[PDB]
Amino acid sequence: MATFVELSTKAKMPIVGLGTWKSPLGKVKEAVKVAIDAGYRHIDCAYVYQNEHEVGEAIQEKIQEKAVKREDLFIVSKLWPTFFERPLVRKAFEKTLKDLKLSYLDVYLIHWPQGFKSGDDLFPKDDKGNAIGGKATFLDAWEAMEELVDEGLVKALGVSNFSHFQIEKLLNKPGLKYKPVTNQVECHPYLTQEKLIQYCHSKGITVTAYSPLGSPDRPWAKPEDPSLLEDPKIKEIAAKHKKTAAQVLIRFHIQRNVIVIPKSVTPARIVENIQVFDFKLSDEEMATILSFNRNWRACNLLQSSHLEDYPFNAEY
């Protein structure tokens, strides 16, 4: 019901998907079922979210119950930066694929460009609190991920939280086999990503907007932080369309041809968040919303700001 953004592979990626970060065990399975019933086909997952097995249970049940076919679903997961060494890329992917109970993934993303030390910890740190970097780089990881496409286990690869310099470094890699089909980055009216979107699109790379509602449930949210859902100017535009602020925040991306993945575990909101194909923001409304840019990020992975490929030191 969601319309599509065409990838460079000619595959069609549904323009609205369901986000699953912070969706707890015991709720995410029902959230995915409700989403599929409401017409969602794209689900955004990750190893680090530690809930992929319940997403997998939901998908498996909906398929068997004949509510949906696998070919019509678009499932994305991500390789966490502690798994950049070749044997670990395969191990991590295999765990993700097993948890999701799938025979293939539609897109597999590098979750962050900066590599972390391999071992048992997901966030390895020294005795100061800083993140310990890894031995392998995202270029090393990419080479192992390409093997997954060669073998038919993943349809396409992509990146997440990459700056244009990092995409350039990937596109320029000697022996490159597969180009990224998307860059999944934070995007919303307070972080409009104009230059990065322009860059990605110029290279035939789509953009997937994460935290489009401003991630109000992020653990580190502070009272004084900007709040998109409460922005009276967003609400003003919404009320005009008899829509919610959330629906305007989602529709904003659709009209820039940017894929968007709002997260909810509340059935009414899951349904609400995909009722976004029955109205249209005017050119004036789009320009007003675009003017709200504050260069504000909900997600910074601050503790990894000192690593070589920390992505947010670049302008874009």
Ligand X SMILES: NC(=O)c1ccc[n+]([C@@H]2O[C@H](COP(=O)([O-])OP(=O)(O)OC[C@H]3O[C@@H](n4cnc5c(N)ncnc54)[C@H](OP(=O)(O)O)[C@@H]3O)[C@@H](O)[C@H]2O)c1
Ligand Y SMILES: NC(=O)[C@@H]1C[C@]2(NC(=O)NC2=O)c2cc(F)ccc2O1
The residues that touch Cl ion, with contacts defined as CB under 5 A, are: 46-48, 78, 80, 111
CB of 52 to Cl ion, least distance (A): 9
Q: Which residues contact 258 (CB under 8 A, 6 or more apart)?
A: 5, 187, 197, 206, 207, 208, 209
94 is in an annotated binding site: no
What are the CA-CA distances from residue 21 to residues 43, 151, 237 (Å)? 11, 28, 28
311 is in an annotated binding site: no
CB of 127 to ligand X, least distance (A): 26
Task: Compute the distance between CA of residue 315 and CA of residue 263 in angstroms, rounded to an integer.
Answer: 27
CB of 267 to Cl ion, least distance (A): 26
- Ordered DSSP codes for 139-205: HHHHHHHHHHHHTTSEEEEEEES--HHHHHHHHT-TT-----SEEEEE-BTTB--HHHHHHHHHTT-
Nearer to ligand X, 49 or 199 (CB): 49
The three-class DSSP label of residue 131 is strand
Residues at the contact surface with ligand Y, assessed by CB under 6 A: 21, 48-49, 299-301
Clarify whether 40 is annotated catalytic. Answer: no
315 contacts which partner out of ligand Y, Cl ion, ligand X, none, CB within 5 to 8 A by kind? none
Nearer to ligand Y, 21 or 74 (CB): 21
Please answer whether residues 88 and 143 qualify as being in contact, where contact means their C-beta atoms are separated by less than 8 angstroms.
no
Task: Compute the distance between CA of residue 177 and CA of residue 209 in angstroms, rounded to an integer.
Answer: 26
47 contacts which partner out of ligand Y, ligand X, Cl ion, none, CB within 5 to 8 A by kind? Cl ion
- In single-letter form, the type of residue at position 2 comes to A
34 is in an annotated binding site: no
21 is in an annotated binding site: yes
Task: Compute the distance between CA of residue 100 and CA of residue 75 in angstroms, rounded to an integer.
Answer: 9
Nearer to ligand X, 16 or 246 (CB): 246
Catalytic residue among 40, 49, 108, 199, which? 49
Tokens of 198: 């322009």
CA end-to-end span of the chain? 32
CB of 10 to Cl ion, least distance (A): 27
271 is in an annotated binding site: yes
68 contacts which partner out of ligand Y, Cl ion, ligand X, none, CB within 5 to 8 A by kind? none
Q: Which residues are catalytic?
A: 49
Residues that bind ligand X (CB under 6 A): 19-22, 44, 111, 160-161, 184, 210-218, 229, 244, 246, 261-266, 269, 272-273, 299
